Amino acid sequence: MATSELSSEVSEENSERREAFWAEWKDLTLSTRPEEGSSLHEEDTQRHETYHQQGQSQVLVQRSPWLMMRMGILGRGLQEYQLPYQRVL
Amino acid sequence: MTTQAPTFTQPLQSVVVLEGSTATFEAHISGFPVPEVSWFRDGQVISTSTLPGVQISFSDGRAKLTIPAVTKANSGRYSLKATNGSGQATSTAELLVKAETAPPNFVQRLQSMTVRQGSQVRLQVRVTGIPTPVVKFYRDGAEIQSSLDFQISQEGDLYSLLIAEAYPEDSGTYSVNATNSVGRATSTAELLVQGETR
Amino acid sequence: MTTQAPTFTQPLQSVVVLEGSTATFEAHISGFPVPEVSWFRDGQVISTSTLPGVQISFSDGRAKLTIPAVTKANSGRYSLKATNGSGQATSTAELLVKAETAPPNFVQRLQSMTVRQGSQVRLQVRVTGIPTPVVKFYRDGAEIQSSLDFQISQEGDLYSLLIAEAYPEDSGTYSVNATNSVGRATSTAELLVQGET
């Protein structure tokens, strides 16, 4: 549906040392997943009862300059990663 | 100490929160003398008169703005400005406040039953959802709307269809469909009224 | 216990995970007799031939499927199907795989400096970013695509502009830019070359 794209900026002026610095980045991204995306149907052929459900979920991806990512399902959990991802085995 | 212009060692981040939740904007700033800081929402400065509730602190380079129970109005561009003699820095990030939704759920699904013609029949379901699902009843794919003989009524989240006087004609596959902006659920079960006639 | 068609106590929930990390779908199921259970991805059956490394477990009611390390390829909707004498139940959810990314960061910013004519000058930044940012050096706002005494080099995430012997005319505002798919960053400093005699 309507992904939302949220940004962050920093802008800095040093007058003492005559230095300037700025930064714009895609910080948080929010999207909608179709209802078919997560569904359940159950058929009870003994009792002749059927049930169906489908529901949207909104997913969250957040990133940063200091290489930390954050993602998950809006309304449930977030998970945080330290980039570059450093597997264990 | 050596003078140093204000600089974000860690800038603000954007914040997506659910309505009624706490929103926290925080940042780390360094510089000497320790900068003077101030927070803005959509370019206007923030105080408790514009954001009733906000807490806000700045100790050992920790800047922090927290909204206790965000509302959807609170969404916008939040900035932190830091100035001292040697210069100035701003960090800007967004708040997106979101509605708590929940797709339709049948806490109680319709159940299948047989009955003796003439008797009263209550077919009930319990449905949850935010926003409140629309609930509609069906027999063999045709919708039943409330009447004398088939009276629909909700009691909280309990929805019943009451067939005052069952007949064999009213046997069939009964469906409840609950729908809202974020999902659908439908429950079906079989109803058989028997009879006996010479 | 008793005859009963399978129902999901807790249906599958969608997951969003970082490429190369572990994903995990879990469900609680009921039914009697115990249901024959099987997993599908985008319609087709799943096995360790289909998805090397899959750990699928079904016991005590809990029905896990784990992907040790996930790949963008792995993305799509996963179903758990439970069948027995009394009927069947199906739960579908999405596995959503996110590539790792991180905007350009100046771990080390340009800093201005005063040098004597004849000095070697090194103007260096340290820049991170997934994907690797494209970095560019600028002098008084025009791009230094570096001919003669203005050698730009790289050593890991360390980019350095080298001026071998400094000339007075070299004084100005230098700026380095870093960009990639999810952000840009810019660092500027002033260089003064102080003459001689």
From Swiss-Prot, chain A:
It is linked to Cardiomyopathy, familial hypertrophic, 25: A hereditary heart disorder characterized by ventricular hypertrophy, which is usually asymmetric and often involves the interventricular septum. The symptoms include dyspnea, syncope, collapse, palpitations, and chest pain. They can be readily provoked by exercise. The disorder has inter- and intrafamilial variability ranging from benign to malignant forms with high risk of cardiac failure and sudden cardiac death. The C-terminal domain appears to be unstructured in solution. It may promote the assembly of higher-order TTN complexes. Interacts with MYOZ1, MYOZ2 and MYOZ3. Interacts with CSRP3. Interacts directly with the N-terminal Ig-like domains of 2 titin (TTN) molecules. Interacts with ANKRD2; the interaction is direct. It comes from Homo sapiens (Human). Muscle assembly regulating factor. Mediates the antiparallel assembly of titin (TTN) molecules at the sarcomeric Z-disk. It comes from the Eukaryota. One of its GO terms (biological process) is detection of mechanical stimulus. GO terms for molecular function: BMP binding; FATZ binding; molecular adaptor activity; protein-macromolecule adaptor activity; structural constituent of muscle; titin binding; titin Z domain binding; transmembrane transporter binding. Keywords: Cardiomyopathy, Cytoplasm, Disease variant, Limb-girdle muscular dystrophy, Phosphoprotein. This is Telethonin. GO terms for cellular component: cytosol; I band; titin-telethonin complex; Z disc.
UniProtKB/Swiss-Prot annotation, chain C:
Residues 6-96, 104-192 form the Ig-like domain. It is found in: Cytoplasm; Nucleus. It comes from the Eukaryota. Autophosphorylated. In some isoforms, after the PEVK repeat region there is a long PEVK duplicated region. On account of this region, it has been very difficult to sequence the whole protein. The length of this region (ranging from 183 to 2174 residues), may be a key elastic element of titin. It is linked to Myopathy, myofibrillar, 9, with early respiratory failure: An autosomal dominant myopathy characterized by adulthood onset of weakness in proximal, distal, axial and respiratory muscles. Pelvic girdle weakness, foot drop and neck weakness are the main symptoms at onset, but ultimately the weakness usually involves the proximal compartment of both upper and lower limbs. Additional features include variable degrees of Achilles tendon contractures, spinal rigidity and muscle hypertrophy. Respiratory involvement often leads to requirement for non-invasive ventilation support. This is Titin. It comes from Homo sapiens.
